[PDB]
Amino acid sequence: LECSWDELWNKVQQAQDLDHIIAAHEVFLDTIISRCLLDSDSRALLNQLRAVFDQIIELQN
Amino acid sequence: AAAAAANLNAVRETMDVLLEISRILNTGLDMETLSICVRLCEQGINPEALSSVIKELRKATEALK
Amino acid sequence: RATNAQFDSPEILRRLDVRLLEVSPGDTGWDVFSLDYHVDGPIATVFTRECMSHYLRVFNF
Amino acid sequence: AQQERDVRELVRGVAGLQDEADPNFQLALNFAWSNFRFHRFLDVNSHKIEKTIEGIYEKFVIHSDLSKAASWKRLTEEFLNADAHYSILSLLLCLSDSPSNSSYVETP
């Protein structure tokens, strides 16, 4: 949420067309999907990450 | 003759599709039980009634165990 | 109005409202909850339902 | 006629009672017949069931499981080429749902 915010806030404030600002938010958000663990190929990664949340909540019992 | 046996084939593959929709909704039916469930729904009956039936009948074999 | 958000614009705080997704008979409040930012005006041309769906996904993470 | 043999097979399958002179079986038969012959259940509407189908499609997408959601919509479009649709769908829906499922075989 910070490198992406820098590239978005650069590519909106210099841009002089709506076609530029829309196509900047698009790549902003698709890079957020790539950097977060919600891609098609990183699914197993997420399914691993859920397992370390399991033993968190289990511990409170 | 010939179509009357391929029509029930056209029943089987739909019966296989519902075997996916059953397991992705985590239901207590198996493939034999669902066949009786389709025979129930073709004659016309509220499925809330059947669902309440199975929602009691399933709790009357593990409450005695 | 306990937090800082009271001092921002009435429009953007009005657009924050809660939402609930579709229920299941087996359910947990942590499983079905969302905040929905409303889109009013012609701003639909700038922001589509698909970017809302990805917004909801990263919010779930 | 066939409905009676059907309800016997229903009790046999679900309740696991293969003895028909067992009084629990006969009480289950009375319970089934009295549930069927005293209905107080609302009549199903197709539009509400369609809203449920789209909602569970949303739940599949929100938890970032794209192939399972695409297969889910694909299997519904193949199934709906067979009234009785909405009856069996609402049956499976109300019978059991416990939220977004931790499950596999999205490409079988």
UniProtKB/Swiss-Prot annotation, chain B:
Keywords from the named record: Acetylation, Cytoplasm, Cytoskeleton
Biological processes annotated in GO: gamma-tubulin complex localization; microtubule nucleation by interphase microtubule organizing center; mitotic spindle assembly
Highest taxon, organism lineage: Eukaryota
Family of this protein: Belongs to the MOZART1 family.
Quaternary structure annotation from Swiss-Prot or TrEMBL: Associates with the gamma-tubulin ring complex (gTuRC) consisting of TUBGCP2, TUBGCP3, TUBGCP4, TUBGCP5 and TUBGCP6 and gamma-tubulin TUBG1 or TUBG2; within the complex, interacts with TUBGCP3 and TUBGCP6 to form a luminal bridge with actin that stabilizes the initial structure during complex assembly. Interacts with TUBG1.
Its biological purpose: Required for the recruitment and the assembly of the gamma-tubulin ring complex (gTuRC) at the centrosome. The gTuRC regulates the minus-end nucleation of alpha-beta tubulin heterodimers that grow into microtubule protafilaments, a critical step in centrosome duplication and spindle formation.
Identification of the protein by name: Mitotic-spindle organizing protein 1
Natural source organism: Homo sapiens (Human)
Gene from which this protein is expressed: MZT1
Part of the full-length chain shown: 11 to 75 of 82
Swiss-Prot record, chain C:
Tissue: Ubiquitously expressed.
Subcellular localization(s) per the UniProt record: Cytoplasm, Cytoskeleton, Microtubule organizing center, Centrosome
Domain of life from the UniProt record: Eukaryota
Quaternary structure annotation from Swiss-Prot or TrEMBL: Component of the gamma-tubulin ring complex (gTuRC) consisting of TUBGCP2, TUBGCP3, TUBGCP4, TUBGCP5 and TUBGCP6 and gamma-tubulin TUBG1 or TUBG2. TUBGCP2, TUBGCP3, TUBGCP4, TUBGCP5 and TUBGCP6 assemble in a 5:5:2:1:1 stoichiometry; each is associated with a gamma-tubulin, thereby arranging 14 gamma-tubulins in a helical manner. Gamma-tubulin at the first position is blocked by TUBGCP3 at the last position, allowing 13 protafilaments to grow into a microtubule.
Similarity comment: Belongs to the TUBGCP family.
Annotated function: Component of the gamma-tubulin ring complex (gTuRC) which mediates microtubule nucleation. The gTuRC regulates the minus-end nucleation of alpha-beta tubulin heterodimers that grow into microtubule protafilaments, a critical step in centrosome duplication and spindle formation.
Protein name: Gamma-tubulin complex component 3
Organism: Homo sapiens
Taxonomic lineage of the native organism: Eukaryota, Metazoa, Chordata, Craniata, Vertebrata
Curated annotation (Swiss-Prot), chain D:
Record text on subunit structure and interactions: Component of the gamma-tubulin ring complex (gTuRC) consisting of TUBGCP2, TUBGCP3, TUBGCP4, TUBGCP5 and TUBGCP6 and gamma-tubulin TUBG1 or TUBG2. TUBGCP2, TUBGCP3, TUBGCP4, TUBGCP5 and TUBGCP6 assemble in a 5:5:2:1:1 stoichiometry; each is associated with a gamma-tubulin, thereby arranging 14 gamma-tubulins in a helical manner. Gamma-tubulin at the first position is blocked by TUBGCP3 at the last position, allowing 13 protafilaments to grow into a microtubule.
Family: Belongs to the TUBGCP family.
Stated role: Component of the gamma-tubulin ring complex (gTuRC) which mediates microtubule nucleation. The gTuRC regulates the minus-end nucleation of alpha-beta tubulin heterodimers that grow into microtubule protafilaments, a critical step in centrosome duplication and spindle formation.
Superkingdom of the source species: Eukaryota
Tissue distribution: Widely expressed, with highest levels in heart and skeletal muscle and moderate levels in brain.
Coiled-coil region list: none
Subcellular location: Cytoplasm, Cytoskeleton, Microtubule organizing center, Centrosome
Name of this protein: Gamma-tubulin complex component 5
Gene: TUBGCP5
Organism field: Homo sapiens (Human)
